[PDB]
Design a binder for this molecule. Structure first.
Ligand code: ATP
Lengths: 227, 37, 393
C-alpha cells in the first residue's frame, strides 16, 4: 500500500518491558521520523499531507532537519520524473532556505538513473549552483549530479566547474562540490582533477585540520573510473 | 524579500513551462504505445 | 595430466595446512572461545568485576514494616531475618514475592527485584518460526479466516474494537481430522506472529509429584502477563483433562487438579487481560464441559475433510516441484481418493516421486500417480487411522 507506516508503529511492544514507558522525549528522534515517511515511501508510494508530521516540524526547529525532510521528499517519487515535479513544486516557493534546498535536492533524487529529454534537474538546479547563501548554494548541486551521474554529460559539468574556481569560503561546500562533480564523472576527468588539486593547494595546503576538507576532494578524482 | 519574490516568480515560470513540456512528451510517448497495441 | 593432476595442488595446500595451523595457535578451549575474542577484555575490565561489585547473592522478601524500612528477608533456607538493606534506591520497589541481590554482612540493595521462575518454562518459548505461510495451507480457507480474525486485529490496530466498544474473543479451539489439521496451521500462526508464542504440550505437564503442574501453570501465566500480549498454544488437551469421574479409589486426580486450576486461572478474578490462548486436541467429546465453557472456548474452528476443491488445491500446493510432462489430471486424482487426508495426499505425491526415481526416470507420469494412489489409499487401506477417529471415539 501507499502508506504502510508500521515499523515505527511496531515500537509499541517494548514500552512495557523494564517498567514505565514513553521515556523517549528527545528531538533528534524526529529526524528518524523523516525516514518513517521517507524510507517507506520508496517504490512509488505517496504521502498527501502525511508529511504533515514533517511539515510542522519543518516549521518548528532544526534547520538541518528542514533540509533533511525536504531532501527525503526526493526519495518519495524516485524515478517518477513526470509526476514527481508537481508534488515538489509546492516547496520550491518556501520562505525557508532549508526547505527550498531540500526541494532542489528532491528534484535531483527523482531524476537519479533516468535520462528525461526535458532535463528538468539541470533546468531547475542550474540557477542555484552559484547562489549567494548555502542551503540553495551547497545543496543546489548535489541532486544534479545524482540526476546526471550515468548520463555523463560534460556540458553541465563545465557549468559546475567554476564552483571550484569560486574561491569563496566553501569549506563544506567545495568538498561536496567535488562529490557532485565526481558523481557526474571521476577518473580520467580533465577539468575535475585540475580544479580539485589546484583548490587543494590554494586553501587545504595551508590548513589540514578536519576530515571535511580532504575526505571529499579526494573522492572527486577517480571513484567513477575505479574499474 | 523583493529579490526572493523575483526569484520565486522566475522559478515558477520555469516550472510551469517544464510541467507543460513533460506532459506533452508523456502524451507523445503514450500515443506511440497505444498505436502499437 | 590426468594421473598427473595430483602434483600441483598438494604442494600449496599442504603448505596452506601448515600456516593455517600455525595461525591456529589460540584453541583447545574446553570451556573457552578464541581468547583474542574470548579474553578480548582481558585487561583491567576483569578487575572491576572484583572490587566494585561484590557477590550480592540472591534473597527473598518476606514482610514489610512501618516507618523506617526494616524488611524481612529469606535467603533460600539459610536464615529468615530482618534488616534495612541500603539507601541507594527509593523504598517503593519492595513487594512480597521478589528477589534482591543481598550481601551477608552489609546487605546492599544492588539491583531491583526480578521474579524467579522455572528455567523449563523459559526454555519452553520457541523463539523460532517455521517456514510455513498462510498460502501453503489449503483446504481449510474458512477455518483460515476464522483464525485470522482471532490472532491479528487484536495484535494489530485496536481502534476498530475500541470504536465499536467490543472486547475481542479470547478462548478459541481449533480442531480437525486426526493427523491432518491444526498443527501445521499453528506453525503458520507462529510464523506470522510478532509477540511471544508460548508452546504447551499437554503430556509434559504431568509430574512425578502432585500439584507441580499447577505451579508451572501459575509461573507461565505470570511470565505471560509480564508481556503486553502473548500467544499461548495448547496441544492434546485430552490427556491434560477429560472429566471429573472419580469413583471409589481415586482415579487420575493428579491431572484433574491441573486442569481445574487452569480453569480457575482462565476465568474470574482479574484475568490475564491481553493474552490470547488457543487449544487443539485429537478427540473433543471427552473434554470437560467446564473447560468447554465459553469465555475459555468461545470460538469453535472445526476442520473437516476437503470435498474436492481442497483436495485439488493441496495437490497444487505440494506438487509445484516435481517433474511432469506438462499436462496433469490432478482433479481426477482427487476423485480417485474421496475420503483422503492432506498428509496422505502429500504421501501420495512423495511415493509417486519415489516410483519415478526407481530405475532412471526423471518425470513421473499420470500412471505413476495411479501407482502412487493405489498402493497408498487402497493398499494400505487396512489401518488408515480414519474410521474409529472420524467418530472421534
Ligand atoms: N490445508 C492444507 N494444505 C496442505 N497441507 C495440509 C493442509 N492441512 C493439513 N495439511 C497437511 O497436514 C500434515 C500435518 O497435519 P497436522 O499435524 O498439522 O494436523 P493435526 O490435525 O494437528 O494432527 P497431528 O498434529 O496429530 O499430526 C502436513 O503434512 C500438511 O501438509
Amino acid at each position: 500500500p501507499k502508506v504502510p507506516d508500521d515499523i515505527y508503529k511496531t515500537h509499541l511492544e517494548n514500552n512495557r518491558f523494564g517498567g514505565s514507558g514513553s521515556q523517549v522525549d528527545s528531538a533528534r528522534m524526529n529526524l528518524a521520523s523523516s525516514f518513517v515517511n521517507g524510507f517507506v515511501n520508496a517504490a512509488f508510494g505517496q504521502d498527501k499531507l502525511l508529511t504533515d508530521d514533517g511539515n510542522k516540524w519543518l516549521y518548528k526547529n532544526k534547520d538541518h532537519g528542514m533540509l533533511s525532510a525536504a531532501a527525503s521528499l526526493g526519495m518519495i517519487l524516485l524515478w517518477d520524473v513526470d509526476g514527481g515535479l508537481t508534488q515538489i513544486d509546492k516547496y520550491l516557493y518556501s520562505s525557508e532556505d532549508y526547505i527550498k534546498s531540500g526541494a532542489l535536492l528532491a528534484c535531483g533524487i527523482v531524476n537519479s538513473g533516468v535520462r528525461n529529454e526535458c532535463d528538468p534537474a539541470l533546468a531547475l538546479l542550474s540557477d542555484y549552483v552559484l547562489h549567494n547563501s548555502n542551503t540553495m548554494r551547497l545543496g543546489s548541486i548535489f541532486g544534479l549530479g545524482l540526476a546526471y551521474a550515468g548520463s555523463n554529460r560534460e556540458d553541465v559539468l563545465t557549468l559546475l566547474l567554476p564552483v571550484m574556481g569560486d574561491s569563496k569560503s566553501s569549506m563544506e561546500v567545495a568538498g561536496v562540490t567535488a562529490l557532485a562533480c565526481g558523481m557526474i564523472a571521476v577518473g580520467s576527468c580533465n577539468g575535475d582533477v585540475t580544479s580539485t588539486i589546484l583548490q587543494t593547494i590554494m586553501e587545504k595546503s595551508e590548513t589540514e585540520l578536519k576530515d571535511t576538507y580532504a575526505r571529499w576532494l579526494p573522492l572527486g578524482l577517480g571513484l567513477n573510473h575505479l574499474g | 524579500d523583493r529579490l526572493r519574490q523575483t526569484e520565486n516568480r522566475a522559478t515558477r515560470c520555469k516550472v510551469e513551462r517544464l510541467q507543460l513540456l513533460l506532459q506533452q512528451k508523456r502524451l507523445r510517448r503514450k500515443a506511440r504505445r497505444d498505436a502499437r497495441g | 595430466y590426468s594421473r598427473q593432476i595430483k602434483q600441483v595442488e598438494d604442494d600449496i595446500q599442504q603448505l596452506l595446512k601448515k600456516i593455517n595451523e600455525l595461525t591456529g595457535i589460540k584453541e583447545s578451549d574446553t570451556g573457552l572461545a578464541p581468547p583474542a575474542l574470548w579474553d578480548l577484555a582481558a585487561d583491567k575490565q576483569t578487575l572491576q568485576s572484583e572490587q566494585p561489585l561484590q557477590v550480592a547473592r540472591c534473597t527473598k522478601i518476606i514482610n514489610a514494616d512501618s516507618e523506617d524500612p526494616k524488611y524481612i528477608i529469606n535467603v533460600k533456607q539459610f536464615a529468615k531475618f530482618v534488616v534495612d538493606l541500603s539507601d541507594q534506591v527509593a523504598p517503593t520497589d519492595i513487594e512480597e514475592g521478589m528477589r534482591v541481590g543481598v550481601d551477608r554482612n552489609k546487605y546492599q540493595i544492588h539491583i531491583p527485584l526480578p521474579p524467579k521462575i522455572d528455567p523449563t518454562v523459559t526454555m519452553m518459548q520457541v523463539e523460532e518460526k517455521p517456514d510455513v505461510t498462510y498460502s501453503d495451507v489449503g483446504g481449510c480457507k474458512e477455518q483460515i479466516e476464522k483464525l485470522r480474525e482471532v490472532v491479528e486485529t487484536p495484535l494489530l490496530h485496536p481502534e476498530r474494537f475500541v470504536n465499536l466498544g467490543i472486547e475481542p474473543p479470547k478462548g478459541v479451539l481449533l480442531f480437525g481430522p486426526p493427523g491432518t489439521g491444526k498443527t501445521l496451521c499453528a506453525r503458520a500462526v507462529a510464523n506470522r506472529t510478532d509477540a511471544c508464542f508460548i508452546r504447551v504440550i499437554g503430556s509434559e505437564l504431568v509430574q512425578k509429584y502432585v500439584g507441580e503442574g499447577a505451579r508451572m501453570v501459575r509461573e507461565l501465566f505470570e511470565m505471560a502477563r509480564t508481556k503486553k500480549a502473548c500467544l499461548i498454544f495448547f496441544d492434546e488437551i485430552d490427556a491434560i483433562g477429560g472429566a471429573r469421574f472419580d469413583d471409589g479409589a481415586g482415579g487420575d486426580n493428579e491431572v484433574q487438579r491441573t486442569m481445574l486450576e487452569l480453569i480457575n486461572q482462565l476465568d474470574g478474578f482479574d484475568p490475564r487481560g491481553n493474552i490470547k490462548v488457543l487449544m487443539a486436541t485429537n478427540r473433543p467429546d471427552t473434554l470437560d464441559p467446564a473447560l468447554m465453557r465459553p469465555g475459555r472456548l468461545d470460538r469453535k474452528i472445526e476442520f473437516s475433510l476437503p470435498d474436492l476443491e481442497g483436495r485439488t488445491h493441496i495437490f497444487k500446493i505440494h506438487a509445484r516441484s516435481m517433474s511432469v510432462e506438462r499436462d496433469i489430471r490432478f482433479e481426477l486424482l482427487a476423485r480417485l481418493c474421496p475420503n483422503s487426508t492432506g498428509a496422505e495426499i502429500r504421501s501420495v505425491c512423495t511415493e509417486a516421486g519415489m516410483f519415478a526415481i526407481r530405475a532412471r526416470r526423471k518425470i513421473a507420469t499420470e500412471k505413476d500417480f495411479l501407482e502412487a494412489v493405489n498402493k497408498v489409499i487402497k493398499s494400505y487401506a487396512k489401518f488408515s487411522a480414519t474410521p474409529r477417529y472420524m467418530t472421534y471415539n
